[PDB]
Amino acid sequence: MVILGVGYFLLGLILLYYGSDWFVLGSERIARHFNVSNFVIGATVMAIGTSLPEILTSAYASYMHAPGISIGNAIGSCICNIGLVLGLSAIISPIIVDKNLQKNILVYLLFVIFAAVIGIDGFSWIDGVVLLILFIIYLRWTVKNGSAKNNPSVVFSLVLLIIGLIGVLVGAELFVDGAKKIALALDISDKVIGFTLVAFGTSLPELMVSLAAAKRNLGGMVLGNVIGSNIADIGGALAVGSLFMHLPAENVQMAVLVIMSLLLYLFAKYSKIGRWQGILFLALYIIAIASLRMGGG
Ligand SMILES: CCCCCCCC/C=C\CCCCCCCC(=O)OC[C@H](O)CO
Ligand SMILES: CCCCCCCC/C=C\CCCCCCCC(=O)OC[C@H](O)CO
Ligand SMILES: CCCCCCCC/C=C\CCCCCCCC(=O)OC[C@H](O)CO
Ligand SMILES: CCCCCCCC/C=C\CCCCCCCC(=O)OC[C@H](O)CO
Ligand SMILES: CCCCCCCCCCCCCCC
Ligand SMILES: CCCCCCCCCCCCCCC
Ligand SMILES: CCCCCCCCCCCCCCC
Ligand SMILES: [Ca+2]
Ligand SMILES: [Ca+2]
Ligand code: NA
Ligand code: NA
Ligand code: NA
Numbered sequence: 261m262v263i264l265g266v267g268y269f270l271l272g273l274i275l276l277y278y279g280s281d282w283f284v285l286g287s288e289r290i291a292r293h294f295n296v297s298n299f300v301i302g303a304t305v306m307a308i309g310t311s312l313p314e315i316l317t318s319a320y321a322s323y324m325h326a327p328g329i330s331i332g333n334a335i336g337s338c339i340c341n342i343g344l345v346l347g348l349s350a351i352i353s354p355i356i357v358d359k360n361l362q363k364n365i366l367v368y369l370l371f372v373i374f375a376a377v378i379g380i381d382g383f384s385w386i387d388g389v390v391l392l393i394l395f396i397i398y399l400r401w402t403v404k405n406g407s408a409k410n411n412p413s414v415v416f417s418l419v420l421l422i423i424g425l426i427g428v429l430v431g432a433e434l435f436v437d438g439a440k441k442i443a444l445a446l447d448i449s450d451k452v453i454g455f456t457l458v459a460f461g462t463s464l465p466e467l468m469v470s471l472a473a474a475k476r477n478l479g480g481m482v483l484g485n486v487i488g489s490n491i492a493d494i495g496g497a498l499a500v501g502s503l504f505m506h507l508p509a510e511n512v513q514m515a516v517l518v519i520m521s522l523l524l525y526l527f528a529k530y531s532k533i534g535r536w537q538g539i540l541f542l543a544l545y546i547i548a549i550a551s552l553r554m555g556g557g
Contacts, residue, residue, distance in 0.1 A: 265441030272435030279427020280468035283309075286421030288478060293414050299361050300406030302473070302484025303491075304399055309425045310465035310485065311337075311492035313432060317462055318497040322504035329455060330501035331383065332557025335513045336459030337497070338372075338490040341466055342520045343545025346486045347538045349470045354534030355479035362529050364402060368487045369525045371398065375494050376514040379507075388502030395495025402488075432464035455556035483533070490521075510557070516548055 283306070291301040314337050322330040357365070371394060378387050443449045466489050473481040501507055520541065527537045 262442055262445035265438045265445055268434045268438030268441060270438070272431045272433070272438055275427045275431030276435060276464060276468045277431075279424050279431050280465075280472040281424070282420050283424030283428055283469055284472045284476065284478065284481065286417050286419070286424050288476075288481065289413075289417035290421055291481075293417060295408050296403070297406045297484075298478055298481040299364070299484035300402060302481040303364070303402050303488030304484075305421075306469060306481070306485045307488025307492050308496070310428065310469055311489050311496060312429065313462035313465065314459075314493050314497040315500060317458065318501035319504065322501035322507065325505065326557075327501060327505045327507045328555075328557030329458065330505075330557070331498060331507040331510055332455070332513075332555075333458050333462060334493045334498035334501065335510055335517060336556060337463050337466075337493045338517050339513065339520065339545070339548060340459055340463045341486050341489050341493075342517075342524055343541050343548060345463065345467050345470045346482070346524070346533070347541030347545060348467075349474040349482045349486075350533045350538030350541065351535050352471070352474040353477045353479050353482070354532055354538075355483055356532045357483065357528040360405060361480065361483065362525075364405070365483075365487060365525050365528045367398065367401070368491060369521050371491060371494070372518055372521045375498075376511075376518050379509060379514055380511060382509045383498060383502040383507040385503050385506075388499035391495040391499040391502075395491055395499070398491055398495070428465040428468060431468075432461065435464060436461040452555050456554045458556045479533075483528075490517075508557075513552065516544075516552075520544060 287301050287306050288298060290305070291298050294301075314333060317333050318330040321327070321333065374394070375391060378390070440449070440454070443454075466485060470482050470485055473479075473485065498507065523537075523540070524533070527533050531537065
Protein backbone atom coordinates (compact mmCIF):
# COMPACT_ATOMS: atom_id res chain seq x y z
CA MET A 261 0.00 0.00 0.00
CA VAL A 262 2.76 2.43 0.97
CA ILE A 263 4.75 0.28 -1.46
CA LEU A 264 2.18 0.67 -4.23
CA GLY A 265 2.07 4.40 -3.52
CA VAL A 266 5.85 4.64 -3.79
CA GLY A 267 5.75 2.68 -7.04
CA TYR A 268 3.14 4.96 -8.57
CA PHE A 269 4.95 8.05 -7.28
CA LEU A 270 8.25 7.01 -8.90
CA LEU A 271 6.74 5.69 -12.13
CA GLY A 272 4.70 8.89 -12.43
CA LEU A 273 7.85 10.98 -12.06
CA ILE A 274 9.61 8.94 -14.73
CA LEU A 275 6.71 9.20 -17.17
CA LEU A 276 6.46 12.95 -16.49
CA TYR A 277 10.17 13.45 -17.02
CA TYR A 278 10.59 11.60 -20.30
CA GLY A 279 7.04 12.14 -21.50
CA SER A 280 7.44 15.91 -21.24
CA ASP A 281 10.50 15.92 -23.49
CA TRP A 282 8.79 13.74 -26.10
CA PHE A 283 5.74 15.99 -26.09
CA VAL A 284 7.98 19.02 -26.59
CA LEU A 285 10.04 17.42 -29.36
CA GLY A 286 6.95 16.19 -31.20
CA SER A 287 5.22 19.57 -30.83
CA GLU A 288 8.29 21.41 -32.14
CA ARG A 289 8.38 19.09 -35.15
CA ILE A 290 4.64 19.47 -35.80
CA ALA A 291 5.08 23.26 -35.68
CA ARG A 292 7.69 23.01 -38.44
CA HIS A 293 5.49 20.66 -40.47
CA PHE A 294 2.53 23.05 -40.38
CA ASN A 295 4.61 26.20 -40.81
CA VAL A 296 3.42 27.66 -37.49
CA SER A 297 5.49 29.26 -34.72
CA ASN A 298 6.39 27.43 -31.51
CA PHE A 299 4.22 29.96 -29.66
CA VAL A 300 1.17 28.91 -31.71
CA ILE A 301 1.72 25.20 -31.14
CA GLY A 302 2.32 25.93 -27.45
CA ALA A 303 -0.82 28.06 -27.13
CA THR A 304 -3.06 25.55 -28.85
CA VAL A 305 -2.23 21.87 -29.00
CA MET A 306 0.16 21.92 -26.02
CA ALA A 307 -1.94 24.24 -23.83
CA ILE A 308 -5.16 22.33 -24.36
CA GLY A 309 -3.58 18.89 -24.08
CA THR A 310 -1.95 19.78 -20.77
CA SER A 311 -5.17 21.49 -19.48
CA LEU A 312 -7.33 18.37 -19.96
CA PRO A 313 -6.81 17.55 -16.25
CA GLU A 314 -8.07 21.02 -15.23
CA ILE A 315 -11.12 20.78 -17.51
CA LEU A 316 -12.13 17.33 -16.28
CA THR A 317 -11.49 18.30 -12.64
CA SER A 318 -13.48 21.50 -12.79
CA ALA A 319 -16.36 19.84 -14.62
CA TYR A 320 -16.46 16.92 -12.20
CA ALA A 321 -16.16 19.07 -9.08
CA SER A 322 -19.05 21.31 -10.09
CA TYR A 323 -21.16 18.34 -11.16
CA MET A 324 -20.51 16.91 -7.68
CA HIS A 325 -21.74 20.15 -6.08
CA ALA A 326 -18.32 21.49 -5.13
CA PRO A 327 -18.19 24.64 -7.25
CA GLY A 328 -15.62 26.14 -4.88
CA ILE A 329 -13.18 23.43 -5.82
CA SER A 330 -14.11 23.88 -9.50
CA ILE A 331 -13.11 27.55 -9.58
CA GLY A 332 -10.28 27.09 -7.08
CA ASN A 333 -8.69 24.59 -9.46
CA ALA A 334 -9.15 26.79 -12.58
CA ILE A 335 -7.86 30.07 -11.12
CA GLY A 336 -5.28 28.46 -8.85
CA SER A 337 -3.87 26.85 -11.97
CA CYS A 338 -3.51 30.16 -13.78
CA ILE A 339 -1.61 31.56 -10.81
CA CYS A 340 0.61 28.47 -10.69
CA ASN A 341 1.28 28.67 -14.45
CA ILE A 342 2.61 32.24 -14.29
CA GLY A 343 4.13 32.34 -10.83
CA LEU A 344 5.82 28.93 -10.70
CA VAL A 345 5.87 27.50 -14.21
CA LEU A 346 6.83 30.64 -16.13
CA GLY A 347 8.95 31.84 -13.18
CA LEU A 348 11.23 28.80 -13.22
CA SER A 349 11.22 28.56 -17.03
CA ALA A 350 12.20 32.22 -17.52
CA ILE A 351 15.30 31.79 -15.36
CA ILE A 352 16.34 28.70 -17.31
CA SER A 353 15.81 30.32 -20.72
CA PRO A 354 15.19 34.10 -20.86
CA ILE A 355 12.65 35.20 -23.49
CA ILE A 356 12.65 38.36 -25.61
CA VAL A 357 9.13 38.70 -26.96
CA ASP A 358 8.62 39.73 -30.59
CA LYS A 359 6.05 42.35 -31.63
CA ASN A 360 3.29 39.95 -32.70
CA LEU A 361 3.47 37.74 -29.64
CA GLN A 362 3.19 40.97 -27.63
CA LYS A 363 -0.23 41.54 -29.19
CA ASN A 364 -1.24 38.01 -28.34
CA ILE A 365 -0.27 38.63 -24.71
CA LEU A 366 -2.27 41.88 -24.69
CA VAL A 367 -5.35 39.97 -25.87
CA TYR A 368 -4.70 37.44 -23.10
CA LEU A 369 -4.55 40.26 -20.57
CA LEU A 370 -7.86 41.72 -21.82
CA PHE A 371 -9.46 38.28 -21.56
CA VAL A 372 -8.28 37.87 -17.98
CA ILE A 373 -9.51 41.35 -16.97
CA PHE A 374 -12.83 40.60 -18.68
CA ALA A 375 -13.14 37.32 -16.74
CA ALA A 376 -12.29 39.07 -13.47
CA VAL A 377 -14.99 41.70 -14.02
CA ILE A 378 -17.83 39.38 -14.99
CA GLY A 379 -16.71 37.11 -12.14
CA ILE A 380 -17.15 39.72 -9.38
CA ASP A 381 -20.53 38.21 -8.45
CA GLY A 382 -19.39 34.67 -9.27
CA PHE A 383 -19.64 32.88 -12.62
CA SER A 384 -23.00 31.79 -14.02
CA TRP A 385 -23.59 29.44 -16.89
CA ILE A 386 -24.00 32.47 -19.18
CA ASP A 387 -20.59 33.72 -18.08
CA GLY A 388 -19.30 30.26 -19.00
CA VAL A 389 -20.81 30.33 -22.48
CA VAL A 390 -19.30 33.74 -23.16
CA LEU A 391 -15.81 32.75 -21.96
CA LEU A 392 -15.95 29.54 -24.03
CA ILE A 393 -16.90 31.47 -27.15
CA LEU A 394 -14.08 33.91 -26.51
CA PHE A 395 -11.67 30.98 -25.94
CA ILE A 396 -12.63 29.57 -29.37
CA ILE A 397 -12.15 32.95 -31.07
CA TYR A 398 -8.77 33.33 -29.34
CA LEU A 399 -7.62 29.95 -30.73
CA ARG A 400 -8.66 30.73 -34.30
CA TRP A 401 -7.17 34.23 -34.19
CA THR A 402 -3.94 32.84 -32.72
CA VAL A 403 -3.59 30.18 -35.42
CA LYS A 404 -4.43 32.64 -38.21
CA ASN A 405 -1.72 35.09 -37.12
CA GLY A 406 0.95 32.49 -36.46
CA SER A 407 0.44 30.45 -39.61
CA ALA A 408 2.32 30.26 -42.92
CA LYS A 409 0.73 11.35 -48.78
CA ASN A 410 2.11 9.33 -45.86
CA ASN A 411 5.32 10.93 -44.63
CA PRO A 412 7.62 9.24 -42.06
CA SER A 413 8.87 12.60 -40.73
CA VAL A 414 5.29 13.61 -39.93
CA VAL A 415 4.25 10.23 -38.55
CA PHE A 416 7.22 10.08 -36.20
CA SER A 417 6.30 13.64 -35.16
CA LEU A 418 2.71 12.83 -34.27
CA VAL A 419 3.75 9.66 -32.50
CA LEU A 420 6.21 11.58 -30.32
CA LEU A 421 3.58 14.21 -29.58
CA ILE A 422 0.76 11.82 -28.71
CA ILE A 423 2.85 9.34 -26.71
CA GLY A 424 4.51 12.22 -24.89
CA LEU A 425 1.11 13.68 -24.06
CA ILE A 426 -0.09 10.30 -22.79
CA GLY A 427 3.14 10.11 -20.79
CA VAL A 428 2.69 13.45 -19.03
CA LEU A 429 -1.03 12.97 -18.32
CA VAL A 430 -0.74 9.38 -17.04
CA GLY A 431 2.46 10.39 -15.25
CA ALA A 432 0.80 13.29 -13.44
CA GLU A 433 -2.08 11.03 -12.40
CA LEU A 434 0.21 8.27 -11.09
CA PHE A 435 2.39 10.79 -9.28
CA VAL A 436 -0.66 12.29 -7.57
CA ASP A 437 -2.31 8.95 -6.80
CA GLY A 438 1.00 7.66 -5.46
CA ALA A 439 1.41 10.67 -3.18
CA LYS A 440 -2.16 10.21 -1.91
CA LYS A 441 -1.61 6.50 -1.27
CA ILE A 442 1.60 7.23 0.65
CA ALA A 443 -0.09 9.92 2.74
CA LEU A 444 -2.99 7.61 3.49
CA ALA A 445 -0.70 4.70 4.43
CA LEU A 446 1.39 6.93 6.71
CA ASP A 447 -1.77 8.29 8.33
CA ILE A 448 -0.92 11.86 7.38
CA SER A 449 -3.79 12.33 4.90
CA ASP A 450 -5.23 15.81 5.18
CA LYS A 451 -8.27 16.80 3.10
CA VAL A 452 -7.61 20.53 3.43
CA ILE A 453 -4.01 20.19 2.23
CA GLY A 454 -5.10 17.81 -0.52
CA PHE A 455 -7.66 20.24 -1.92
CA THR A 456 -5.16 23.10 -1.60
CA LEU A 457 -2.89 21.07 -3.92
CA VAL A 458 -5.48 20.18 -6.57
CA ALA A 459 -4.44 23.04 -8.89
CA PHE A 460 -0.77 22.09 -8.55
CA GLY A 461 -1.48 18.44 -9.31
CA THR A 462 -3.36 19.29 -12.49
CA SER A 463 -0.53 21.73 -13.44
CA LEU A 464 2.18 19.07 -13.33
CA PRO A 465 1.94 18.57 -17.08
CA GLU A 466 2.38 22.33 -17.68
CA LEU A 467 5.29 22.41 -15.24
CA MET A 468 7.26 19.53 -16.76
CA VAL A 469 6.46 20.38 -20.36
CA SER A 470 7.51 24.00 -19.84
CA LEU A 471 10.73 23.01 -18.08
CA ALA A 472 11.53 20.57 -20.92
CA ALA A 473 10.91 23.36 -23.42
CA ALA A 474 12.99 25.84 -21.44
CA LYS A 475 15.95 23.41 -21.28
CA ARG A 476 15.86 23.30 -25.09
CA ASN A 477 15.66 27.11 -25.22
CA LEU A 478 12.21 27.03 -26.80
CA GLY A 479 11.06 30.29 -25.20
CA GLY A 480 8.14 30.96 -27.52
CA MET A 481 6.79 27.47 -26.78
CA VAL A 482 7.07 28.15 -23.05
CA LEU A 483 5.18 31.41 -23.35
CA GLY A 484 2.50 29.91 -25.63
CA ASN A 485 1.95 27.03 -23.22
CA VAL A 486 1.55 29.38 -20.23
CA ILE A 487 -0.69 31.93 -21.98
CA GLY A 488 -2.73 29.27 -23.77
CA SER A 489 -3.11 27.14 -20.62
CA ASN A 490 -4.49 30.06 -18.65
CA ILE A 491 -6.99 30.83 -21.39
CA ALA A 492 -7.92 27.14 -21.55
CA ASP A 493 -8.32 27.04 -17.79
CA ILE A 494 -10.65 30.07 -17.85
CA GLY A 495 -12.57 29.67 -21.13
CA GLY A 496 -12.50 25.91 -20.79
CA ALA A 497 -12.14 24.60 -17.21
CA LEU A 498 -13.81 27.45 -15.33
CA ALA A 499 -16.40 27.87 -18.10
CA VAL A 500 -17.44 24.20 -18.09
CA GLY A 501 -17.65 24.17 -14.30
CA SER A 502 -20.05 27.13 -14.45
CA LEU A 503 -22.35 25.14 -16.74
CA PHE A 504 -23.17 22.71 -13.90
CA MET A 505 -23.55 25.16 -11.06
CA HIS A 506 -22.97 28.81 -10.24
CA LEU A 507 -19.31 29.30 -9.22
CA PRO A 508 -18.74 31.51 -6.18
CA ALA A 509 -16.59 34.61 -6.62
CA GLU A 510 -12.85 34.42 -5.98
CA ASN A 511 -12.14 38.13 -6.14
CA VAL A 512 -8.81 38.01 -4.29
CA GLN A 513 -7.39 35.25 -6.46
CA MET A 514 -8.65 36.92 -9.62
CA ALA A 515 -6.94 40.16 -8.53
CA VAL A 516 -3.69 38.25 -7.97
CA LEU A 517 -4.10 36.73 -11.44
CA VAL A 518 -4.81 40.10 -13.03
CA ILE A 519 -1.71 41.55 -11.35
CA MET A 520 0.53 38.68 -12.50
CA SER A 521 -0.95 38.87 -16.02
CA LEU A 522 -0.36 42.62 -16.13
CA LEU A 523 3.25 42.15 -15.11
CA LEU A 524 3.64 39.44 -17.76
CA TYR A 525 2.36 41.81 -20.43
CA LEU A 526 4.50 44.75 -19.26
CA PHE A 527 7.68 42.62 -19.22
CA ALA A 528 6.82 41.18 -22.65
CA LYS A 529 6.17 44.63 -24.13
CA TYR A 530 8.80 46.83 -22.49
CA SER A 531 11.50 44.48 -21.26
CA LYS A 532 12.13 40.75 -21.43
CA ILE A 533 10.98 37.68 -19.51
CA GLY A 534 14.31 36.66 -18.06
CA ARG A 535 16.08 36.00 -14.80
CA TRP A 536 14.85 38.87 -12.65
CA GLN A 537 11.36 38.76 -14.06
CA GLY A 538 11.24 35.02 -13.23
CA ILE A 539 12.61 35.69 -9.75
CA LEU A 540 9.76 38.18 -9.24
CA PHE A 541 7.12 35.74 -10.50
CA LEU A 542 8.42 33.05 -8.11
CA ALA A 543 8.53 35.51 -5.23
CA LEU A 544 4.90 36.51 -5.87
CA TYR A 545 4.01 32.82 -6.18
CA ILE A 546 5.65 32.01 -2.83
CA ILE A 547 3.86 34.94 -1.21
CA ALA A 548 0.59 33.71 -2.69
CA ILE A 549 0.96 30.20 -1.34
CA ALA A 550 2.04 31.64 2.02
CA SER A 551 -1.04 33.86 2.31
CA LEU A 552 -4.06 32.72 0.27
CA ARG A 553 -6.78 30.82 2.12
CA MET A 554 -6.13 27.07 2.12
CA GLY A 555 -8.57 24.40 0.98
CA GLY A 556 -8.50 25.05 -2.76
CA GLY A 557 -12.05 26.31 -2.40
C1 LIG B 1 -12.35 43.13 -29.09
C2 LIG B 1 -11.17 44.04 -28.73
C3 LIG B 1 -11.66 45.47 -28.49
C4 LIG B 1 -12.67 45.53 -27.33
C5 LIG B 1 -12.00 44.99 -26.07
C6 LIG B 1 -12.96 45.05 -24.88
C7 LIG B 1 -12.24 44.44 -23.68
C8 LIG B 1 -13.12 44.47 -22.43
C9 LIG B 1 -12.37 43.76 -21.30
C10 LIG B 1 -12.39 44.42 -19.92
C11 LIG B 1 -13.17 45.72 -19.76
C12 LIG B 1 -14.47 45.52 -18.97
C13 LIG B 1 -15.50 44.60 -19.63
C14 LIG B 1 -16.66 44.55 -18.62
C15 LIG B 1 -17.87 43.73 -19.04
C16 LIG B 1 -18.80 43.79 -17.81
C17 LIG B 1 -20.10 43.00 -18.02
C18 LIG B 1 -20.91 43.04 -16.71
O1 LIG B 1 -20.91 44.03 -15.99
O2 LIG B 1 -21.57 41.86 -16.45
C19 LIG B 1 -22.27 41.76 -15.20
C20 LIG B 1 -22.74 40.29 -15.06
O3 LIG B 1 -23.41 40.06 -13.80
C21 LIG B 1 -21.51 39.38 -15.10
O4 LIG B 1 -21.95 38.03 -14.98
C1 LIG C 1 -10.23 36.15 -27.40
C2 LIG C 1 -10.40 37.52 -28.05
C3 LIG C 1 -11.19 38.36 -27.06
C4 LIG C 1 -10.44 38.49 -25.73
C5 LIG C 1 -11.35 39.32 -24.83
C6 LIG C 1 -11.56 40.63 -25.54
C7 LIG C 1 -12.53 41.50 -24.76
C8 LIG C 1 -13.91 40.86 -24.63
C9 LIG C 1 -14.70 41.91 -23.86
C10 LIG C 1 -16.20 42.15 -24.12
C11 LIG C 1 -17.02 41.35 -25.15
C12 LIG C 1 -17.63 40.24 -24.30
C13 LIG C 1 -18.65 39.31 -24.97
C14 LIG C 1 -19.84 40.16 -25.41
C15 LIG C 1 -20.27 40.94 -24.15
C16 LIG C 1 -20.59 40.03 -22.96
C17 LIG C 1 -20.93 40.93 -21.75
C18 LIG C 1 -21.23 40.10 -20.51
O1 LIG C 1 -21.32 40.64 -19.41
O2 LIG C 1 -21.33 38.75 -20.73
C19 LIG C 1 -21.69 37.82 -19.67
C20 LIG C 1 -23.03 38.20 -19.04
O3 LIG C 1 -22.84 39.37 -18.26
C21 LIG C 1 -23.47 37.17 -18.03
O4 LIG C 1 -24.73 37.61 -17.51
C1 LIG D 1 3.29 18.26 0.15
C2 LIG D 1 3.88 17.53 -1.02
C3 LIG D 1 2.96 17.51 -2.25
C4 LIG D 1 3.61 16.68 -3.26
C5 LIG D 1 3.01 16.44 -4.66
C6 LIG D 1 1.57 15.99 -4.96
C7 LIG D 1 0.50 17.05 -4.78
C8 LIG D 1 -0.92 16.53 -5.08
C9 LIG D 1 -1.38 15.52 -4.02
C10 LIG D 1 -2.89 15.66 -3.64
C11 LIG D 1 -3.77 16.76 -4.28
C12 LIG D 1 -5.20 16.41 -4.84
C13 LIG D 1 -5.98 15.64 -3.75
C14 LIG D 1 -7.43 15.41 -3.92
C15 LIG D 1 -7.63 14.47 -2.72
C16 LIG D 1 -6.94 14.93 -1.48
C17 LIG D 1 -7.25 13.88 -0.43
C18 LIG D 1 -6.48 14.26 0.78
O1 LIG D 1 -7.02 14.33 1.88
O2 LIG D 1 -5.15 14.26 0.54
C19 LIG D 1 -4.38 14.83 1.58
C20 LIG D 1 -2.87 14.47 1.65
O3 LIG D 1 -2.29 15.29 2.64
C21 LIG D 1 -2.14 14.75 0.35
O4 LIG D 1 -0.77 14.34 0.53
C1 LIG E 1 13.51 14.52 -12.37
C2 LIG E 1 12.49 15.35 -11.58
C3 LIG E 1 12.61 16.84 -11.93
C4 LIG E 1 11.60 17.61 -11.08
C5 LIG E 1 11.64 19.13 -11.31
C6 LIG E 1 10.61 19.69 -10.32
C7 LIG E 1 10.45 21.21 -10.32
C8 LIG E 1 9.38 21.44 -9.24
C9 LIG E 1 9.01 22.91 -9.09
C10 LIG E 1 8.31 23.31 -7.78
C11 LIG E 1 8.03 22.22 -6.74
C12 LIG E 1 6.77 22.57 -5.93
C13 LIG E 1 6.51 21.55 -4.80
C14 LIG E 1 5.21 21.97 -4.07
C15 LIG E 1 4.08 21.88 -5.10
C16 LIG E 1 2.69 22.34 -4.62
C17 LIG E 1 2.78 23.82 -4.26
C18 LIG E 1 1.44 24.45 -3.87
O1 LIG E 1 1.30 24.96 -2.76
O2 LIG E 1 0.45 24.39 -4.82
C19 LIG E 1 -0.68 25.23 -4.49
C20 LIG E 1 -1.71 25.25 -5.65
O3 LIG E 1 -2.38 23.99 -5.82
C21 LIG E 1 -0.99 25.67 -6.96
O4 LIG E 1 -0.38 26.95 -6.86
C1 LIG F 1 -8.70 27.45 -37.15
C2 LIG F 1 -8.01 26.38 -36.29
C3 LIG F 1 -8.65 26.34 -34.90
C4 LIG F 1 -10.13 26.00 -35.06
C5 LIG F 1 -10.87 25.93 -33.71
C6 LIG F 1 -10.32 24.86 -32.77
C7 LIG F 1 -11.16 24.91 -31.48
C8 LIG F 1 -10.70 23.87 -30.44
C9 LIG F 1 -11.58 24.04 -29.19
C10 LIG F 1 -11.20 23.08 -28.05
C11 LIG F 1 -12.12 23.35 -26.85
C12 LIG F 1 -11.78 22.44 -25.67
C13 LIG F 1 -12.71 22.72 -24.48
C14 LIG F 1 -14.16 22.46 -24.89
C15 LIG F 1 -15.09 22.74 -23.71
C1 LIG G 1 -9.47 45.80 -13.54
C2 LIG G 1 -10.61 45.27 -12.66
C3 LIG G 1 -10.08 44.03 -11.97
C4 LIG G 1 -11.06 43.35 -11.02
C5 LIG G 1 -10.19 42.20 -10.52
C6 LIG G 1 -10.76 41.21 -9.50
C7 LIG G 1 -11.17 41.81 -8.16
C8 LIG G 1 -12.36 42.76 -8.14
C9 LIG G 1 -12.40 43.13 -6.67
C10 LIG G 1 -13.61 43.93 -6.20
C11 LIG G 1 -13.32 44.16 -4.71
C12 LIG G 1 -14.50 44.78 -3.96
C13 LIG G 1 -15.60 43.72 -4.07
C14 LIG G 1 -16.87 44.14 -3.34
C15 LIG G 1 -17.90 43.02 -3.48
C1 LIG H 1 21.32 30.01 -14.71
C2 LIG H 1 21.61 30.82 -13.44
C3 LIG H 1 20.32 30.88 -12.62
C4 LIG H 1 20.47 31.68 -11.32
C5 LIG H 1 19.09 31.59 -10.72
C6 LIG H 1 18.86 32.30 -9.40
C7 LIG H 1 17.39 31.98 -9.12
C8 LIG H 1 16.85 32.64 -7.85
C9 LIG H 1 15.38 32.24 -7.68
C10 LIG H 1 14.92 32.97 -6.43
C11 LIG H 1 13.47 32.71 -6.09
C12 LIG H 1 13.27 33.57 -4.84
C13 LIG H 1 11.88 33.48 -4.27
C14 LIG H 1 11.86 34.38 -3.03
C15 LIG H 1 12.92 33.91 -2.03
CA1 LIG I 1 -2.83 21.01 -16.55
CA1 LIG J 1 -20.97 36.81 -13.00
NA1 NA K 1 -2.49 23.49 -20.28
NA1 NA L 1 -3.58 23.09 -12.59
NA1 NA M 1 -3.09 24.68 -16.40
